[PDB]
Design a protein around this ligand. Structure first.
Ligand SMILES: O=P([O-])(O)O[C@H]1O[C@H](COP(=O)(O)O)[C@@H](O)[C@H](O)[C@H]1O
Ligand SMILES: [Mn+2]
Ligand SMILES: [Mn+2]
Ligand SMILES: [Mn+2]
Length: 391
């Protein structure tokens, strides 16, 4: 093998400008990093600059360098969707024709009626809301009627909330399994069905740790699947394991923030393993992208960049670092959904003694999976062109 360990970092939603097909998604003028850089009056990311982020595209405070540490380019998404599942599944060697849906006006009547008819329970709510806001509004009604609080977020989820003393956990889990079967439908395909049990009284409701997720498996066997079957290590950090529904994962590390995510990346650098370490930094998307907060987004990027020098110091000669994104989420853009954007790609190894160069534009996210697969000599994915030999 050329590289013993590959460390892949997904900076979630950190796009680098509108894709060629952005108009179809209503995403013209979208530019995640660029608008953040403009808002911040110059983004302070000297370590990403040294890798060659500005060499991909120059933005305010992000300039190009003569000798970048590693190789640089951007990737174009080939799959139909701009959601998290689609992005991550493509990265690992798949092509997804059927996009996952978001529901800013609530779920369609047809789906809710069929869920009512199958469960024998009424449905209240049907709108985007946080866990705290929806329980204060409809929690008391739920307790008194025995109905189900169905709600969503800015992402592709269907959440069902019910009181543990009123609706038993096992009954709530069975309802979510039915909801999962009904949402395996093109008209209303959700990425994740989430059980949201809660306890307490009107005025003081609290969500219990009895939360259960019901996700879909990737539409095809991934490079992660092939690595695991060939006895390689596949360490998932953050929400990576959940996104792939555990497929191809040998070990999973839970994180609570971006800084905690970088701590667990440092933990894997200290581990004697052979294979892939896979990190997702979710804060960019969940906290700032969807909430349209360019200031908080900007600060988070600067906080992330300041952690990189320690990562550079720990990388060995046979280690490869890959930094990318799964889609865009422009914090200065209409609505609450993601943006169809190019994603940056940086590939760095300390063994690159004379630095890196420009790679050809990656026509699919699957080029990463193809590179990972060729490196470890496992079955090549159906989609993607490896850039291993260019490095
Ligand atoms: O808790 P996570 O990170 O798994 O987040 C989970 O629930 C969130 C709701 O947030 P809230 O609690 O404010 O309603 C969703 O947006 C997200 O898709 C889901 O993975
Ligand atoms: Mn848009
Ligand atoms: Mn994402
Ligand atoms: Mn999102």
């Amino acid at each position: 093998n050329k590289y013993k360990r590959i460390f892949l970092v997904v900076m979630d939603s950190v796009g680098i400008g509108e894709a060629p097909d952005a108009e179809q998604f209503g995403d013209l003028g979208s530019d995640t990093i660029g608008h953040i850089a403009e808002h911040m009056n110059g983004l302070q990311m000297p370590n990403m600059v040294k890798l060659g982020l500005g060499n991909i595209r120059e933005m305010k405070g992000i300039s190009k360098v003569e000798k970048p540490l590693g190789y640089y380019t951007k990737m174009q998404e080939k799959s139909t969707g701009k959601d998290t599942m689609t992005g991550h599944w493509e990265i690992m060697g798949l092509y997804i024709d059927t996009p996952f849906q978001v529901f800013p006006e609530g779920f369609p009547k047809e789906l809710l009626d069929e869920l009512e008819e199958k469960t024998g329970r009424k449905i209240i709510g049907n709108k985007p809301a946080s866990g705290t806001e929806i329980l204060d509004e409809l929690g008391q009604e739920q307790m008194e009627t025995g109905s189900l609080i169905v709600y969503t977020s800015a992402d592709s989820v269907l959440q069902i909330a019910a009181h543990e003393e009123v609706v038993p956990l096992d009954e709530l889990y069975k309802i979510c399994k039915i909801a999962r079967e009904l949402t395996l439908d093109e008209k209303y395909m959700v990425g994740r069905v989430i059980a949201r049990p809660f306890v307490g009284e009107p005025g003081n409701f609290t969500r219990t740790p009895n939360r259960h997720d019901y996700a879909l498996k990737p539409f095809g066997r991934t490079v992660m699947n092939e690595l695991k079957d060939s006895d390689y290590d596949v360490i998932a950090i953050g929400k990576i394991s959940d996104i792939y529904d555990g497929e191809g994962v040998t070990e999973s590390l839970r994180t609570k923030s971006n800084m905690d995510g970088m701590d667990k990346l440092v933990d894997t650098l200290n581990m004697d393993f052979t294979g892939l370490s896979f990190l997702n930094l979710v804060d960019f998307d969940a906290l700032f992208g969807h909430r349209r907060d360019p200031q908080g987004y900007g600060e988070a990027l600067q906080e992330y960049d300041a952690r990189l020098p320690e990562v550079f110091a720990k990388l060995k000669e046979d280690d490869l670092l890959l930094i990318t994104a799964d889609h865009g989420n422009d914090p200065i853009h209409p609505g609450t959904d993601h943006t169809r954007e190019y994603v940056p790609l940086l590939a760095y190894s300390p063994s690159m003694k004379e630095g890196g160069q420009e790679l050809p534009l990656r026509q699919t996210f699957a080029d990463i999976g193809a590179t990972v697969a060729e490196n470890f000599g496992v079955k090549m994915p159906e989609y993607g062109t490896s850039f291993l030999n260019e490095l």
